[model samples]
Target: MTLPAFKAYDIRGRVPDELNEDLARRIGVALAAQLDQGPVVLGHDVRLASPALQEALSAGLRASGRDVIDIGLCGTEEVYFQTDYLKAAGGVMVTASHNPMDYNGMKLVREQARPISSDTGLFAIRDTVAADTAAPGEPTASEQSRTDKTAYLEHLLSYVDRSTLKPLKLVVNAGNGGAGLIVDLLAPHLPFEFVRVFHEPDGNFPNGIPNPLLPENRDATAKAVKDNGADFGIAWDGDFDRCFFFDHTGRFIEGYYLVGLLAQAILAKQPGGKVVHDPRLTWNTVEQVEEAGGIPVLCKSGHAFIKEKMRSENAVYGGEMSAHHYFREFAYADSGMIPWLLIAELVSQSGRSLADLVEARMQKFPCSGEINFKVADAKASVARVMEHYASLSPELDYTDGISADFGQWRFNLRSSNTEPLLRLNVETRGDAALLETRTQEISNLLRG
Candidate 1:
């Protein structure tokens, strides 16, 4: 096995060619050796190949004398929650997430749901799986099923005071993934009236892949919100790990602004707590954190880096411009469900629409949303970008990538970990004109 599926952070690749039941089983056996002795939590998404892959993993784990606590069809966060909640040695979620139908992969975590990245144990597992050619032995331990989500639902509701929540109408689009199941489960507990669209969990993805980041897929949720006269709308990726928002006016909210909005919301509850933010876009989050009487801590981009930084700083909350939000109370794992819950509470308590809450922040820090470029050489391209800006003497930081700050405007250029592409994001302090001008200039420089 070439083991091309193993990445810097997790295992992901096209099915059969890169990942199959045999490899999944071997990964399970390898993971059992890396983790401390305890039952392993297992879960899967609504992908066609997910259940079979999970069963193979369970067989391998059980063959290694490790018990498996199977949490039937669920979001990626459920695996994280169950791993820590059950005090298991580790957990694995079989999901393709927002990837195409032919792709399937797994997200691994150790006790307390801490990430097991390449530096940690992912590559070790990969190497072990690659070398292992022996036939998988018979199961030594039994696999148990856990279908009840009462504890998880109760925990989600605990994030906000239901007593203070108003009966607000909201639109929710699950994109034919697993989020609708969670929404239905939480419905009776909350006061909000829901207008559900594409709520079914179909691995076929008849409504198309559940990626709300694409403008084309966002139309349904936006239209539903406007048609229903709802307060706001929310959409989730295939596995429901990252969520996207649309206001009552059917306008999609940029993920950058939500970082600040969520920072303020979390700060209101735990005053003086530390908040972790990615270095990709900074001004709005830094200012909002300070204004909320909280300390702002900057960490490199990506979920693993942000989660580790949050744990180290004992931060109350952490958010990425890509819609990943982590909560300290949730064991430093990102949750798509928790963000919207917090936002709903914020709307109810402030007695303001979602638009009114984030409008000012959007105006104060205008941003040219993340743009991607496919280049021949990432290193050479980055060098060219730096050379083009050297004359300006812009302040530079290489936390995750090259972040050049030039007084009123700044831009961060980083290469994507999963693709041969360079990602760019530029922002200006209350100057949309400057933001556009600098964005175009950087685009030209990057392409040049």
Candidate 2:
């Protein structure tokens, strides 16, 4: 059993080949041992390959003398909520997130749902799982378990006073994934009228993978919003951990601007509150945090790192350019269900359309979303890009990734931890044309 199965944030790899029942069982035992014996909550998404893996992992957890509560067929946020609300030692969510169906994995957390990063016990768990390759015992003693989503829902509703949210027509595309359950649960409770799109859960992803970041995925949701005269549109990925939005005009509001919008909303209540943002996109967030009188902290690009930093800094809210939003009140865990409600609340309170609130920031900080390129040598490609940009720019930063500024057009290039790809994000100060031009130059340079 090679250790490639275990990565920085989670135990993920190709099923059967890298991850199997035996590996999952061993990893579970190892995690339980590392954390010491306590209640361990377990949940998984609707991925095709989750059941057996969940059971194998549960067996190993029980073997380690840890109380196991199995919350069947729930989203990742639910697992986070159960761990924090139930006062459990930690949790394991069996999901590959938006990864392809052929690949399945697990996300582990420490006490209070704090992430298990490479530096923090993940490496140790990998070693243990590798050394103790034998299958663990499957105890017949099953503790009673029930749904905790109602409590989670109550906490979600706490973010906004619903009385203040005016009746608005909106289009919500669940993308035929985990969010359908949450949308169905929250729709009847809200004051707005929702035109549901792809509301049913279909693991096959007939409408294609539920990744709204891809232009292909947003077509249905955007059209639905525009055709129905919806005030705005929202979409989520497979696990529903993050969400993306569009205005009533069918314009895709970059998640970067939404980060700023949400940051302002949170800061208005908790003055000078800390805000966490991913390094992939930063100009607007930096400006928003500074202007709103809040401290801004940029973290490495990933949910685990962002969530852990949020907990440590006690950040009131954290957001990624990828659409994941985290709240401190929710135990510093990211929730796809929470961001839109908070934004809706902000829209209502300002007595402005959703487009109006985000338009200013969008104009202030223009971006070329994120572009990816495959390279024979990812490290070398990043080095070339960095070296080329460094000689030209007086201002350069490498907080989490390589970032260089040329006053007007700025971009950051980061290497993916699990893939042979470089992710590029370019932005400009109120210059969309400059942004597009800079993005193309970098894209071509990297390809060359």
Candidate 3:
């Protein structure tokens, strides 16, 4: 009953211990009661334990008098799609998203797929569930088959010009996770040659976990691209909700560069439009948006905050440092599907290599992406670092995060929203050496 593991944005913890069917049942019932027990959409990823937990969650929701519409075996983004497409009162996606297989949880959204974080209704739900309470009335269980898998595919395809998009041999590494299904579903529809690596949906993850961010896991996809002589390689985590890319030369492009590239692509269509970006990595995004004749609105570094800001500003696109890209047409929610589509479209139209595009952006912002440090006291550590920087310079900003500059290099240090750590993002103006120097200084201080 006491799930001290419930965190902001999602309820994630080591499965069977910090998370289990009992906690999920309580959460499901509490969420249903809070939302008036209206129709709820349920979806789960390709995690090994997801099926059992999904069943238990559905049972809890039904017990709370909420009608359940099951859209089985889908990514986190699909839950948002079904919620909006079906007009459900709320939706739940049982996924840990890029975490280890042993860790699993849920992401909840209100009507229209609006996110429910701690500041929103997540805290209330947490408290309710912690009390080991359930909804008052016994709700009847009626199965409803509602899915937007086909519609979601069509929606994803619409982001690019299908007819004009050029054909290129590409390698897609699903890492034996959910992406295999979605990529296989999309391969034939796309006008290109796709050489899929480990494209089988294996929840056991025979090749290991599906997290592509880890350098060790990136080898397979990079090798596939090289072995196939493909134009590029794409990799996705367990749910395929977040994607990472490697160029033709097998060089991995960080998500920060992807944000800048995608922002430019979006701005090309809607000139002078607004773009929402997270505060963690801002220099490249801010510069790119301005260069594209669009306004850049920097928000807190999270999906829920970015989505809400997108809706309010009517932004054309939103991106975060974590590679989550949101599209205006896609209900202003983040999509791992859209970024690759746009990148592919860009490559097709301009005939410019992904490496070239990324390299150009690199020279513009020259960022070191994001580096996380597990500190004893994230706030205290950040404050101490801020004080050190402040003594050196008076021109500093603490609008959303701590940012200080020495003209050549600028670094932003902010605490994690869901973990006990401090994340640092630094950028230098066309000076890689300066960037490295500044980055090392900060890293030493934070780590020390």
Candidate 4:
């Protein structure tokens, strides 16, 4: 019962070998015990094993005399939305996201859809499951199905003034994940024309894994945008918890610039609101948030940290350069569907192309787009970089990692929690040449 699936953020691992039905059932029992007095919401993605795992989870929850509200097949955010919407005690989403073909995982959340990470109650649940040696209890038939997504769809439309939306052509590549289903449902209400590519739920992933962040996986969406002459393109991961963007010209726009664009868009509606952002890429977001008459609150790069900070500051929006956008109205949880909708509205209202929207910011704060390096030793490599930059008297910040600011330019270097690599991001105050030069210098230092 000591599962390897329990990670710093959520439960994820290779299926059968690391995570199986028996363990999943135990997790269900443990989760029910951890939650308060309301019914628990459950959902699963299009993975081959997800449904069975969810069923086993339901069995365990029902066995414990906890009412189970099954939402059936859905994207991860649906669990968050339904949990908060129904005032449920908590929720669980069965998805491995873009892990691998033979993998699956679960994302847990408590009341108000708050995250249950390692520091929260995830590890505690893990321990409880590990200690339990009793037989699986009898399952009850108290499960209820609430698959009608009318209210969820309505809440999505509430973010935009539907009357102002133009009939923009959008290329949506679901990558054979669960996003296509939501797109199909929302299609009847929206004004945009959708050019769906790989828009079917196939657990086998006929095209590939549903991760548009990979350059190889982006071709389908990018090509569809150009072929159809669409205004913009959007693609999601396996569970649709994160969405990636491509411009009309078939160029992949970095998510760093999107934070600012979305901040401006949201601030246009809610003036003087706070926007939370990660420290990896900051200048552009900070500048845009300030210019929009909004406050920019900096938090470490992670879902838990951003949500906690956003909740505390009452931030109107929170974004990660990794394409996760968190909204205040959505129980402070990150939503893959919401970001693209906001981008579409911005395009419709401004009469500007998606490429045109982020072009200026790209020039204003050119970045090194999160480079990852496999070093022999992490601490030694970091020290080498620090020693090399010591003479420059750069301002150092250790919020999430080491963020060294050298007045005109800056960079953040941090070792990834799950990978043995140092992630690097460099940006300048509108200096592309300096950006290139410093990036190479850092690369050399990191490699050595």
Candidate 5:
């Protein structure tokens, strides 16, 4: 009954074993029991297994008498948007995102697109599915097909001022995920020329699984940007819930810089609103938020934690160094589409290259992009790191993991929940050497 697929957030597992048609149907029955009385929104990515999974989910909900509104072959955010837009009781998106081809998962949300992570009700659903031993119920409700993207497309275009958009050449790589469907839909509405790479939505992932964070997967986007002399490049994961950017120089910009720049842009639209950011990267976000006449609140990473924090603080936007960007206007959910559009508008209005916009800030707050260390013993390694830095009397905060600050330089070391490694990020105030040395020192200690 113990399902490893029922992780901290949503249901994700390998096919036929951890998560099969049976389990998905049971989950649908359980989800109906957990939610208030209303139809449930459903959607799936372009993965080969995705449609079958969605159908299984649909069957379960229908059996439980909960009408299923299927938004076929869509991104994760589409589910979130539809759930909120339609005011459904809840919604689930079938997407493993950047996970390997063998893997597939679901992300669930209740009314207003609020997350249903473990801390909330994800575990409860797991327990429900585990305890149930009754025979499957007969179908009681009909499955409704609602694939309209008119409202969704309009919402996306609203983020930018159409008149200000330049016909600049840009590179977009979807990695054969469902992101292209969205980009293509938005194309007619905007003035920019797109140089599409891996634009087709193929579940097989002819390119790698759409995760541009990998150095190997980024080349296509970056090279296209440089060769075409495009303004910038964008690449998204399988579901496109998160997006990565490359400047005109083909330099893959650090995720945190985008957080900082986007925070500034959002603040201008709704001045004096708060901006929520993760603990791993701080100084730049804090400084930029403050400079833009907004408040910067430090929240832990991950969508569930950040979304809850944004709702409570009434923050305008939230971003993680992991490339996830959330906005208050988008039902407190993250959208890969929104970030690129905002960045595009930023580029057009300023008449400066994307690189120029982030250059000064990058130098001011140089960071050691997140590095992972698969150690012999994670707990012991963390203890050793803390022990080594104790004498330095570095100020520490365990907001997400352990953030130890030493005035000019600081580092955050946290154990990965799903992976075996300890994730590390270091930043120095205008000091690249200090950033490197400190990062290395921590690396040596952890690997000891």
Candidate 6:
């Protein structure tokens, strides 16, 4: 089977084999046809091959007579921001984003930073690229570099009151990704002292790819937090779109907890606004949003789905347990930068450590973090899990996947969209023992 570079959400694949300048340029041409008639915002990561791919995309965009606003070397959120901020028709970011060194990809968006997923014009672009065999024409429009960070920085700072912020110490580990650049730009505006680690943006990834989700990659940030005695630590993926947190006690905070923490933080500022959350793990987020005088809305997992729901509801904020946080002020797009800023403000105002803010919620809703299994038949595996739990008279839901909610414990099992695996998540009401037992029980059934 000839696998296409385009996936359900974005364009990601091995470099040279699945993605190259020709493909990138063709994608640019197809995207131009898909978007409204206006200039397009372009940005790239620190990868070695990113610039060349971006150039090809620029050439194709110009060939289509669309002006290109080049925002050189920025995070994925920057592309989203600039597209909406500049009132451009669309935007593209050339980034592999936590993939291996040999891989590269592109994230696309339309006006107001709305996502362009498979069901929403991505597949059409893919088909256009597949059918086009003509050579790319020379540039007929302009490509200008807009490297200014003033507007973007000011927007990030707008989330908190500077006068209310205290001079707290923080540990920031960029893991040799692009996040360090944004931190440096914002440092002078904030009151916190930062201890930077793996801060340099070297695409070579001298510290082994920048994925903090891996157990081995997480230790650096944890050690830095403890060694520096900082209030907390923050880390990001390769493109710096998703952020991970570590508490003062050198413990990595599960992404599940940040959803509730941030919802509470955002709700405090905008009272009675709606907060959207993924269905995979829900009790804590729903309860937190309700307690904070806000409405809690559940949506299917994935960025496109979350962004769509947020727009429809005019939600103040949306979060996935996987660390993607969306905001209304940010054109309803996800931002890794916004989450930590809001958390820092929460810490400064509340005079509580990051650990203190999330401790009770974690205890109240003990959860088994997402567990993935490589399966030969994902549908069969899901059926097996559902069959084993069917007799329990649990309430079932299919918003995104099969969610079986038993009295004390519940589990969500779904097939992966990008891989041959089944993902599982289990949670219980204030019972870690029940969480573990049910997690293993579901695991065995899925495997069997």
**Candidate 1 residue pairs that clash:** none
Give the least accurate 10-residue stretch of model 6, judged by summed lDDT. 1-10
Model 5 agreement with the true structure over 1-448: per-residue lDDT tens digits: 4888899988889986888888888899889988998999999998888899888888889998999998899999999999999999999999999898888889999998998988788999999998889888888999889999999999998999999989989899999999999988989988999999999999888878788977888888999999999999999999999899999999998898999999998988999999999999899999999999999999888888899999999998999988999999999999999999999999999898899988999899999999989998888999999998899899999898899999999999889876668999999999999988988888999886
Model 2 Cα displacement at 200 (Å)? 2.0
Question: Candidate 1 at residue 211, lDDT?
Answer: 91
Please give me the total number of clashing residue pairs in predicted model 4: 0
TM-score each candidate.
Answer: 0.98, 0.93, 0.94, 0.98, 0.98, 0.98
Candidate 5 residue runs with Cα over 4 Å from true position: 417-420
Model 4 pairs whose backbones collide: none
Number of the top-ranking candidate, with lDDT as the measure: 1
lDDT of 2: 0.84
lDDT of 4 by residue, 394-413 (tens): 99999989999999999999
lDDT of 2 by residue, 40-139 (tens): 8888887778878988888888877778888888888899889888888899999887777778899888788888888889998888877884645766
Candidate closer to the true structure by lDDT (higher is better), 3 or 4 = 4
- Per-residue CA lDDT of candidate 3, range 30-68, in tens? 888777436899998878888888878888888877789
Q: Which stretches of candidate 4 lie over 4 Å from their true place?
A: none
Q: How many backbone clashes does candidate 1 have?
A: 0
Indicate the TM-score of model 3: 0.94
Error of 4 at 329 (Å): 0.5
RMSD of 4: 1.1
